[PDB]
């Protein structure tokens, strides 16, 4: 009647780009 | 005389040898005992079977002088656990065995794994197997009582079941991505793999 | 001669020419453990983290939503980049009790084939053992 | 007679340190504390252990029924300047009482819930059977002996009572300061 | 004296030997401990009898340097 | 020659040039265990305590409020400064049954990268072991 | 039904600057 | 010293020999 709790699932509301600027490792 | 046996044996002295202070050799290439290594657990941990754990350092680890990064962040630590849990226990003993630096440095630290605040062993959610331990007895008793009721309405097996399944050790579940510490149990020396050089100014 | 071969191999690994970069990455969840940059070169996916950030644990998410381990290597001058050895539409980032989802919005199922046995198209891996 | 009382810490000296790790006695483990104060010599003139020195110890064996304190042995202290001495001394409370003590979990439910539940279901079944018109001892015998667990919070004050003489003659020396 | 038996045996030191860092030889021809190999199970597994399992790697496994496909 | 190198390394460690200091720190709680000064240089955080004060225990507070251990070194002429090896928005100070919260009010997520492997930008850590 | 007590949480009312004066280690 | 019997025996290392590809 009791099961192992799952890890937190992230909310899918605040979806935004990861890259605000081009990385310099890309040489750009 | 050798009399007064009880009083004479409670008066036997306890003589503890003194200690002399020493000094650490190179504190820039050294990580001493009691240093806390903060790493993030990669594998999900279930203590049914003996197994191996893995974590990655979340932060750089400096020397005792606090001037040289001896273990880089993202270093991979490998450990293992065994033996399972006993009734009333909620934490498993994990031994971390080896750490690999991203640049190829390897050191065998055989240290105890702890929680985020240094409490001994890893702990998570505990499954005590209540039903697997008591359901046989409960079911046997209830069917016995139901049969007795039906027999009356015409107008010990439960102890045996409980004796066999009462001793089932609990199982620990720890989620992946949980923060853990490694408390360094011995002195770690990095003199053979690193050296320092001054940078030419400007 | 072998030093010459080793120098050639290192030069070929470093030159890193003819590489296309995918920067279409979104994220939702706990932004405090978020990378400052994420991209892939068609073979590996790179997440870059700031100096003051803890390095989290990164997980591979399949179509049904199940997480699984993926091998990682830590690269970069200051060990600030986690490189995972796969290109995937969705990633999961976990640190403690915080989670963040990363979405590849330009996922290419085809990718580029690995005909050489190395991470670079300029080095063969050749069978020394013979036998 | 003691040799040099400026480079000496004798038995029975109290070292006041603050507990860093949170202590839970389920598994054997290692503790850590930091000295909150400078420790002087027996003459009281030279600081032999600086404040902020790190002490490493360990405990093992768990608790027995009726016990509320765990034995902790402190093994080594490291000075911020690099001095190391192996003191193998008993850890105590803030007022010198032996062992570390905190909040005790006696596992009442894990020890008696099986028996209570078995008895109550037996009685309920008997009542239902009557309304038509030992397993409890076995359960208790197996789970009655569960040792208690001690919880001690992080940041708690503790003492180390020095069990042996500590000699600092090889690592320090004194020199007079030129006046003005 | 050899008295104080209980207290004297709880004060026996635990001295753990230190460790020295080494270095891995060739990180392009190496797969180290703790590497995760992701494979797909071929056989159906039923634990009635002891038996042998079989799986196939679903992905390439690189070296610790991450530059050579070793498996 | 090695004495010359060691002298150069010590001079580079001491010179401590091009360092920015953050002094925006607030505190709430039990002020009797409070430091007299707190600041950070972008890599380490320094809490300075008075001569008559006991040195407390300092803990790392994450976003959810969970405390965790952080390594510390004791620096200063009179061992009156605790240097923690991290820069964090919130800190917890505990001594006995008294607690004090420290808040970094100018937290920089980016920080400054550690490209050299040492606490100073003037010393490389170089791989001696080769292998 | 009984759990380990938590350490005291500091009150968030008397929030004041730590630095009344510039430290001398900053050379200021 | 040989004390700390339980903790010292849980800290005994497990050293597994490496393998070479053929």
Q: How many CB atoms lie under 10 A from the CB of residue B121? A: 22
Strand partners, C74: C82
User: If you measure CA to CA, which chain B residue comes closest to A8?
Assistant: B175
What are the backbone dihedrals phi and psi of residue E26, each rounded to the nearest 5 degrees, phi first? -125, 110
Of the candidates B77, B106, B108, the one whose C-alpha atom is nearest the C-alpha of residue B94 is: B77
Largest CA distance in chain H: 45
B84, B47 Cβ separation under 8 angstroms? yes
Strand intervals (E) in D44-180? 47-49, 54-59, 69-70, 72-78, 83-85, 89-92, 100-101, 103-105, 149-152, 157-161, 166-167
The sign of the dihedral angle between the CA atoms of F14, F17, F22, F23 is positive
Q: Which residues pair with F118 in a beta bridge?
A: B68
Q: What is the Cα–Cα distance from B84 to F103, expressed in whole angstroms? A: 42
Distance CA D132, CA B12 (A): 73
Strand D72-78 versus strand D69-70 pairing type? unpaired
Strands (E), chain D: 8-9, 14-19, 23-24, 29-35, 39-40, 47-49, 54-59, 69-70, 72-78, 83-85, 89-92, 100-101, 103-105, 149-152, 157-161, 166-167
Asked if B116 contacts B180 with a C-beta cutoff of 8 angstroms, the reply is yes
**Is residue F57 within a helix (H) or strand (E), and if so which, with residue range?**
strand F57-61
Method: cryo-EM
Mutate which of D15, D40, D49, D52 to test chain F, going by most F C-beta atoms within 10 A?
D52
What is the distance between the alpha carbons of residues F72 and F53, in angstroms, rounded to a whole number?
Answer: 18
Mention every residue, 6+ apart, whose C-beta is less than 8 A from residue A3.
none
CA-to-CA dists, residue G27 to B10, F20, F47, F49, F77, angstroms: 62, 12, 16, 17, 14
Return d(Cα F105, Cα F85) in angstroms, integer. Answer: 18
The alpha carbon dihedral of F100, F105, F110, F111 has a sign of: negative
Q: Tell me the backbone φ, ψ of residue D171, rounded to 5 degrees.
A: -120, -15
Å resolution of this model?
2.5
Task: Select from C39, C81, C97 the Cβ nearest to the Cβ of A8.
Answer: C97
**Domain map (residue ranges) of chain D:** 1-109+148-180
Q: What is the 3-state secondary structure (H, E, C) of chain B?
A: CCCCHHHHHHCCCECCCCEECEECCCCCCEECCCCEEEEEECCCEECCCCEEEEEEECCCEECCCCCEEEECCCCEEEEEECCCCCCCCCEECEEEEEEECCCCEEECCCEEEECCCCCECEECEEECCHHHHHHHHHHHHHHHHHHHHHHHCCCCHHHHHHHHHCCCCCEEEECCCCEEEEECCCCEECCCCEEEEECCCC
Other CB atoms within 10 A of residue D15 CB: 24
- Please give the Cα distance from A21 to C118 (Å, whole number): 30
* Residue C91 Cα distances to A10, B176, C57, C103, D57, angstroms: 12, 14, 11, 6, 42
Element (H, E) at D43: none
Set of chain B residues whose Cβ sits within 8 Å of the Cβ of F68 = 38, 116-117, 179, 181
The residues with which F58 forms a beta bridge, in sequence order, are F93
Single out the residue of B126, B47, B51, B41 nearest to residue B89, CA to CA.
B126
The alpha carbon torsion through C67, C73, C75, C80 (nearest 10 deg) reads: 40
User: Residue D31 and residue B166: Cα distance in Å, rounded?
Assistant: 35
Residues forming a β-bridge with C28: C101
Distance CA B135, CA B131 (A): 5
For chains E and A, having 3+ Cβ pairs within 8 Å is answered no
Query: Which residues are within 8 A (CB) of F25 and not within 5 positions of it... i.e. 6 or more apart?
Result: F38, F39, F102, F103, F104, F105, G17, G18, G19
Chain F contact for C67, CB < 8 A?
no
Give the residue among D40, D6, D36 at the shortest CA–CA distance from D20: D36
Asked if E59 and E71 touch (Cβ cutoff 8 Å), the reply is: no
- Which positions in chain E touch B74 (Cβ < 8 Å)? none
E57 sits in which H/E element: strand E55-57
Minimal Cβ distance to D61: which of H1, H6, H10: H6
Determine the distance in angstroms separating the CA of E35 from the nearest CA of chain D, rounded to an integer. 28
Closest by CA to B28, choosing from C120, D138, F119, is F119
Measured distance between the N- and C-terminal CA atoms of chain G, rounded to whole angstroms:
55
Chain A interface with C: residues with Cβ < 8 Å = 7-23, 25-26
Count CA within 13 A, CB hemisphere, residue B17.
Answer: 6
Distance CA B22, CA D168 (A): 8
Q: What phi and psi, each to the nearest 5 degrees, are found at residue B105? A: -80, 135
Closest to C71 in 3D by CA, of F118, D166, E64: E64
Q: How far apart are CA F4 and CA B3, in angstroms?
A: 72
Q: Closest approach of chain D CAs to the CA of G3, in angstroms?
A: 8
């Amino acid at each position: 009647c009791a099961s192992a709790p799952k890890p937190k699932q992230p909310s899918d509301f605040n979806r935004e780009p990861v890259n605000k600027t081009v990385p310099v490792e890309i040489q750009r | 005389g050798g009399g007064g046996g009880e009083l004479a044996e409670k008066l036997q002295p306890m003589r503890l040898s003194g200690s002399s202070a020493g000094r650490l050799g190179n504190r820039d290439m050294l990580i001493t005992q009691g240093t806390q290594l903060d790493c993030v657990l990669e594998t999900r941990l279930v203590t049914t079977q003996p197994g191996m754990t893995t974590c990655h350092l979340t932060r750089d680890v400096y020397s005792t002088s606090g001037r040289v990064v001896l273990l880089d962040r993202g270093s991979k630590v490998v450990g293992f656990y065994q033996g399972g849990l006993r009734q009333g226990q909620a934490r498993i003993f994990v031994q971390w065995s080896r750490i690999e630096t991203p640049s190829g440095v390897v050191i065998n630290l055989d240290s105890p794994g702890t929680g985020p605040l240094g409490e001994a062993g890893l702990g998570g959610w505990i499954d005590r197997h209540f039903w697997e331990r008591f359901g046989g007895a409960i079911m046997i008793s209830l069917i016995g009582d139901l049969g007795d009721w039906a027999s009356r309405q015409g107008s010990s097996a439960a102890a045996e079941a409980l004796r066999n399944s009462i001793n089932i050790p609990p199982t620990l579940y720890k989620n992946q991505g949980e923060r853990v510490n490694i408390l360094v149990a011995r002195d770690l020396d990095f003199s053979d793999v690193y050296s320092l050089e001054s940078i030419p100014t400007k | 001669r072998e030093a010459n071969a080793r120098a050639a191999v290192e030069a070929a690994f470093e030159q890193r020419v003819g590489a296309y970069y995918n920067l279409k990455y979104m994220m939702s969840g706990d932004k405090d453990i978020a990378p400052v940059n994420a991209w892939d070169d068609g073979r590996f996916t790179y997440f870059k983290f700031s100096a003051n950030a803890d390095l989290p644990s990164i997980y591979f998410v399949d179509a049904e939503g199940n997480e699984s381990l993926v091998p990682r290597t830590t690269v970069g001058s200051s060990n600030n980049i986690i490189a995972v050895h796969k290109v995937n539409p969705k990633w999961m980032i976990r640190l403690g009790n915080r989670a963040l989802a990363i979405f590849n919005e330009a996922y290419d199922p085809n990718g580029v084939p690995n005909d050489t046995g190395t991470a670079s198209p300029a080095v063969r891996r050749v069978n020394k053992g013979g036998n």
